[PDB]
Amino acid sequence: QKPYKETYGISHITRHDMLQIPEQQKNEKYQVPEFDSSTIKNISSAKGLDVWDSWPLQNADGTVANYHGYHIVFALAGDPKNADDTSIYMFYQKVGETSIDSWKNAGRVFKDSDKFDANDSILKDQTQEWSGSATFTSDGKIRLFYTDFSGKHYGKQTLTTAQVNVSASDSSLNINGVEDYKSIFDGDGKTYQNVQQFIDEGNYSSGDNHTLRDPHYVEDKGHKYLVFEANTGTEDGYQGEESLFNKAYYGKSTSFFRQESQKLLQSDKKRTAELANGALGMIELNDDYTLKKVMKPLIASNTVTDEIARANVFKMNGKWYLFTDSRGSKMTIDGITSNDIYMLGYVSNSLTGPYKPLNKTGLVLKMDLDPNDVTFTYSHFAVPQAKGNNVVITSYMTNRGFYADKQSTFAPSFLLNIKGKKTSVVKDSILEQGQLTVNK
Ligand SMILES: OC[C@H]1O[C@@](CO)(O[C@H]2O[C@H](CO)[C@@H](O)[C@H](O)[C@H]2O)[C@@H](O)[C@@H]1O
Ligand SMILES: [Ca+2]
Numbered sequence: 001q002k003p004y005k006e007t008y009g010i011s012h013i014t015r016h017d018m019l020q021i022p023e024q025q026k027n028e029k030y031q032v033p034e035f036d037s038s039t040i041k042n043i044s045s046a047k048g049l050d051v052w053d054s055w056p057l058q059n060a061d062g063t064v065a066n067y068h069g070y071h072i073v074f075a076l077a078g079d080p081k082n083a084d085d086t087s088i089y090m091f092y093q094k095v096g097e098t099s100i101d102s103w104k105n106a107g108r109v110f111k112d113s114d115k116f117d118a119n120d121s122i123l124k125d126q127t128q129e130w131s132g133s134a135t136f137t138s139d140g141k142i143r144l145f146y147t148d149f150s151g152k153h154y155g156k157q158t159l160t161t162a163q164v165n166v167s168a169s170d171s172s173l174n175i176n177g178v179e180d181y182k183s184i185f186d187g188d189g190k191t192y193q194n195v196q197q198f199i200d201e202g203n204y205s206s207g208d209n210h211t212l213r214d215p216h217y218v219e220d221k222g223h224k225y226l227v228f229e230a231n232t233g234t235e236d237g238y239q240g241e242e243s244l245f246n247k248a249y250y251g252k253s254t255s256f257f258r259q260e261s262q263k264l265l266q267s268d269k270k271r272t273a274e275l276a277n278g279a280l281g282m283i284e285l286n287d288d289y290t291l292k293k294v295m296k297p298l299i300a301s302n303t304v305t306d307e308i309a310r311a312n313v314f315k316m317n318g319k320w321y322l323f324t325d326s327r328g329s330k331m332t333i334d335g336i337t338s339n340d341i342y343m344l345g346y347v348s349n350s351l352t353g354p355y356k357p358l359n360k361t362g363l364v365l366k367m368d369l370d371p372n373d374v375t376f377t378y379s380h381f382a383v384p385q386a387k388g389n390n391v392v393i394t395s396y397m398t399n400r401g402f403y404a405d406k407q408s409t410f411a412p413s414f415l416l417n418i419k420g421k422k423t424s425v426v427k428d429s430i431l432e433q434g435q436l437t438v439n440k
Contacts, residue, residue: 014251022335045105062314065136068168147213230281410434
């Protein structure tokens with residue numbers, strides 16, 4: 001096919017920027033710090049469960065919420081023997097506490113019967129609960145967003161919401177139940193891929209990776225939004241053979257396009273690149289948390305990867321910062337290995353863009369430890385703070401199902417300094433496992 005150029009009015013993780021990362025990531029400024037394995041404990045209240053992807057109850061601006069004197073963290077958890085066993089649990093600590101042992105376990109957010117009682121057609125076919133966010137409303141309610149995964153329908157993923165009813169006393173929190181439990185968005189075909197388009201390809205046998213998950217709630221000027229992991233649809237630069245000739249996905253120059261595109265077309269990664277159309281999508285919600293407006297993606301990753309996860313966005317000191325986690329094993333970029341794991345980041349003067357790369361390339365964090373390493377971390381998440389130039393990076397530690405005595409747990413948190421369009425890991429800033437704030 002003939003070369004063309006089309007941005008679709010959105011930002012892009014370009015091949016040229018990603019190719020700069022292999023050399024850049026040797027700089028300790030952009031490296032997840034080494035952790036000390038002999039300080040690492042299992043979450044004592046989680047009782048033999050793997051606990052991975054986690055997120056704090058957040059205020060509208062992303063700072064950590066105070067629920068009746070408690071911090072609350074939602075986390076995926078399940079049997080280490082069963083990789084398809086995933087439910088959201090709610091942990092909580094008193095404000096002031098920092099030890100991993102301070103985290104009590106209120107149990108699952110949902111009963112099995114909740115999805116049926118919701119009178120929601122998609123929800124009644126759910127088989128797993130995957131990641132999202134949680135915001136603390138102005139009328140004092142815990143408002144959860146998460147991913148409804150259905151294994152019965154070829155891995156359908158649906159952005160979902162519920163209010164979690166929680167009684168608070170001097171000693172404990174107790175989940176009483178949920179309400180307003182409903183599907184919000186399952187893709188539209190034109191902006192964000194839906195599950196039927198995945199099935200059109202031949203589902204899992206095709207090599208395609210359909211995502212519509214990890215919704216993150218944020219507000220600006222009283223407007224409510226979710227920003228989430230997705231994939232592009234037919235009208236904002238879809239996957240396919242033709243996608244490899246779109247110079248917007250390469251950047252730099254036409255000379256770089258010709259060279260990189262012909263290399264890619266001759267490589268064993270041609271098909272992978274064709275299928276790769278990850279996106280950080282966006283929708284506006286109404287005041288009852290239903291869908292107001294499908295919006296254009298903030299950024300896309302055509303040709304480089306199909307999987308940019310754990311969308312996160314917030315305002316900090318007059319600028320908007322947009323983050324995503326991604327595995328080098330699923331990328332098509334020379335020099336990036338299957339061991340490499342990233343938090344990528346971008347910056348704008350507005351929530352809705354346009355976003356340009358942090359640290360010139362997109363690199364913020366790199367982690368490349370062996371999957372077998374007990375101190376392996378993934379799912380890095382920047383928790384904004386009330387004031388200052390630091391955010392707190394949370395992550396989970398130790399791969400799921402790897403070790404009988406060492407489960408997936410809260411990683412030691414650490415600090416990331418952010419100023420303008422640059423970031424750096426703060427020297428020797430390792431905090432307690434699962435610590436959410438600098439202030440104690
Ligand atoms: O467990 C699902 C949950 O984990 C995340 C990020 O850790 O994605 C993981 O699981 C996906 C489905 O198995 C994989 O495709 C991905 O490589 C892995 O990181 C979230 O995106 C998801 O909600
Ligand atoms: Ca795809």
